[PDB]
Design a protein around this ligand. Sequence first.
Ligand SMILES: *[C@H](C)[C@H]1/C(=C/c2[nH]c(/C=C3N=C(/C=C4\NC(=O)C(CC)=C4C)C(C)=C\3CCC(=O)O)c(CCC(=O)O)c2C)NC(=O)[C@@H]1C
Ligand SMILES: *[C@H](C)[C@H]1/C(=C/c2[nH]c(/C=C3N=C(/C=C4\NC(=O)C(CC)=C4C)C(C)=C\3CCC(=O)O)c(CCC(=O)O)c2C)NC(=O)[C@@H]1C
Lengths: 158, 158
Amino acid sequence: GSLQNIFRATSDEVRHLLSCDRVLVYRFNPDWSGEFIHESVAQMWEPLKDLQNNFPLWQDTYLQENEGGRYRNHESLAVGDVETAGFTDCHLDNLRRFEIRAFLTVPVFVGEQLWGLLGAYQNGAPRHWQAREIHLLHQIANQLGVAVYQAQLLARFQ
Amino acid sequence: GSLQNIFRATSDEVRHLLSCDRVLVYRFNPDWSGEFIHESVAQMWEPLKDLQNNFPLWQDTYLQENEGGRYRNHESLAVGDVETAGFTDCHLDNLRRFEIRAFLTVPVFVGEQLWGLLGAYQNGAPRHWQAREIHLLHQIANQLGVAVYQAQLLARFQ
Ligand SMILES: *[C@H](C)[C@H]1/C(=C/c2[nH]c(/C=C3N=C(/C=C4\NC(=O)C(CC)=C4C)C(C)=C\3CCC(=O)O)c(CCC(=O)O)c2C)NC(=O)[C@@H]1C
Ligand SMILES: *[C@H](C)[C@H]1/C(=C/c2[nH]c(/C=C3N=C(/C=C4\NC(=O)C(CC)=C4C)C(C)=C\3CCC(=O)O)c(CCC(=O)O)c2C)NC(=O)[C@@H]1C
C-alpha cells in the first residue's frame, strides 16, 4: 500500500503537470516482460484498470527481446503522433487499443536496475512534446525510482 | 553543507551503533583514486582531519588499478586484526599510519555507481566483526548512497 501511494502520487503529479490524459507505471519482470501496476487517467477516458484492479497485458516482444531496449541507457522515447511514427503493426495496434495517440515514455531506475517505465499519454489528439517536458518526466521518474528503492531498503531490513 | 550534514549524521550514527573508534567516508574520483570527505572520531584519538578541514592522502594503488575492486560487486571487507591479515607492506603501513587495528569497509552506491566507501575502524585493539555488524553497515551505506543521490537529484534540477 505504501508503494501504491508512491505510484499514485507520482502518476497524478505527472498527469497534473503535463496535462496529459493518462499516466502509466509499468514494471519489468525478470524476463523483461512487464506488468502495469498503476494508472492515473482523466475521467473522460475508459480506464485500463478494471474493477478488480487488474490491468490488460501489453506483450511487447521488442522490449523483451532487447532486455529493455533504449531504456537500459536511460533514454526516453517521445512520439507526437503514433499514426505517423512508422511503427510495426502489432505495436500500433496495441497503441490504438490503449487509446494512445501520442506518448512520452521514460525509464525508471531503482538503484542500479531498470525497474520499469513511466509513460505519459495523450489520447484524443497528437501532441508535440517539448524538450522541457521530456527532461521533466525523466527527473520525475528518477525520483520515483529513488522512492521505490528507499521503500525497499526500509521494508526489508528490520 | 547539506551533504556534509548527511555525512556527519551517518558517520556519527555508525560510530554510535558499532561503538568503533573512527568512521570515515571516502569518495572515489573519476580515476579511482579517492579523497576522505568526512570523519567521526572519538576524542581520545588523533583525528585524520586537520584544522583546515583537510584530510591526509591514502594513495591506494590496488583500488585504483582494480577500479574499486571488490566493492564494484557490492562486497565488503572485514578485517579483525590488520597485523595478522597478510597484507602488503605499503598497505599495512598506511593502516598503521591511520591507527587502524581492525576495519570494516563497505561500498557506497549512489544510484548505479560505486561512489565511495564507508569504513568503521577500531584503533586500539583487534575486533572480531560479527556478521550482523557487517550486514548493518552495508545497509547504512546503501541508505547513505540513496541520501546522496536524492540530494543530487534536488540540487541540480531546478
Ligand atoms: C509486435 C508483435 C509487438 C510489439 C513490437 C514492438 N514494440 C516496439 C517498441 C516499443 N514497445 C514499447 C512499449 C511500451 N510503450 C509504453 O508506453 C508502454 C507502457 C509503459 C510499453 C509497454 C516501447 C516504449 C517501444 C519503443 C522502445 C525502444 O527501445 O525504442 C517495436 C519497435 C518499434 C516498432 O514498432 O517497429 C516493435 C516491433 N509491441 C507490441 O505491443 C506487439 C504485441
Ligand atoms: C601499496 C603501494 C599501496 C596499497 C596497496 C594495496 N591495497 C590493497 C587493498 C585495499 N586497500 C584498501 C583501501 C582502504 N581501506 C579503507 O578502509 C579506506 C578508507 C575508506 C581505503 C582507501 C582496501 C579497502 C583494500 C581491500 C580491497 C579489495 O578489493 O579487497 C591491496 C590488496 C591487499 C594487500 O594488502 O595485498 C594492496 C597491494 N595500498 C596503500 O595504501 C599503499 C600506498
